[PDB]
Design a protein around this ligand. Sequence first.
Ligand SMILES: [Cl-]
Ligand SMILES: [Cl-]
Ligand code: NA
Ligand code: NA
Ligand code: NA
Ligand code: NA
Ligand code: NA
Ligand code: NA
Ligand code: NA
Ligand code: NA
Length: 323
Amino acid sequence: GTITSQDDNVVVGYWHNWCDGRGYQGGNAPCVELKTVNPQYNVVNISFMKVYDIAEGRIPTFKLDPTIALSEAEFIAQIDTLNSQGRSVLIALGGADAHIELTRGDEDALAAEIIRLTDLYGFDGLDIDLEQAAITAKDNQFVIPAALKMVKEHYRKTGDNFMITMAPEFPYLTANGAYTPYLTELDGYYDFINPQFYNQGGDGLWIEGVGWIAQNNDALKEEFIYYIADSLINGTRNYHKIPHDKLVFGLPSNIDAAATGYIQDPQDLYKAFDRLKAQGQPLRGVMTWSVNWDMGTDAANNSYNQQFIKDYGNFIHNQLPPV
Ligand SMILES: [Cl-]
Ligand SMILES: [Cl-]
Ligand code: NA
Ligand code: NA
Ligand code: NA
Ligand code: NA
Ligand code: NA
Ligand code: NA
Ligand code: NA
Ligand code: NA
């Protein structure tokens, strides 16, 4: 394919390589064709690159799930289409039950596999989306960055910006937290980070004059967005620094998509984002788990009707370009 990178704001959505996932409130996430995904998702993350069978060894790979009833050639054609529209298609490495447990020395094979898949499908980059058990499994913290630096250099030789993004769960972004080796090794290689501000229950931060602000507190959602982002973009309040132009705020698309974290009132985001912008540190966009959920149904089979992209697409894409 052709490597198609993003230079401006992003609305990132994950795409399920499976069908009919059950939601946290009993809804359903269908498989969907890439051509069906709303065009305001300008980064779409194919979920997931993983180990499918230990007989194949340690190096993860990708296989389009036959249940989606899309041929590989047609999947590739649809990637092609997204790329013609200026949209990126990343491969997401990890996910639940991915069995990624790499040993030092595996970085050459992992880089080679990434390049092979990138060249085959036309992917534009890779998202590191490891499950909790994988963050510090075996030599993952060494191998995965080492592999990705080689990939990045490989495409730089031909003038292509192979995108590297990550989806850490936010509590692992404390100073010296478990995700920090990925971030420090890949500083100058990653394009943006889209942490998961969801599925962390009552984790959060204390702010003088406001009090305890949890990820699951709807009444303080503006404050949570603002302060957790402010902390990350400045490296304050015991968080590792992720520059604002490289920080994308990850959210569930709806209450089926994640156990906690859904933004009930989008104005809480609009206001938090505007405060970050006003202090000269606008964020780079939003991310969601997932396009399939945004296109999914609740327990009574009512369509979620693309409510996430309706709420945030225009808001994000109408902002000024990053610097
Ligand atoms: Cl699912
Ligand atoms: Cl579809
Ligand atoms: Na077997
Ligand atoms: Na293989
Ligand atoms: Na068709
Ligand atoms: Na491409
Ligand atoms: Na906890
Ligand atoms: Na409120
Ligand atoms: Na800046
Ligand atoms: Na623009």
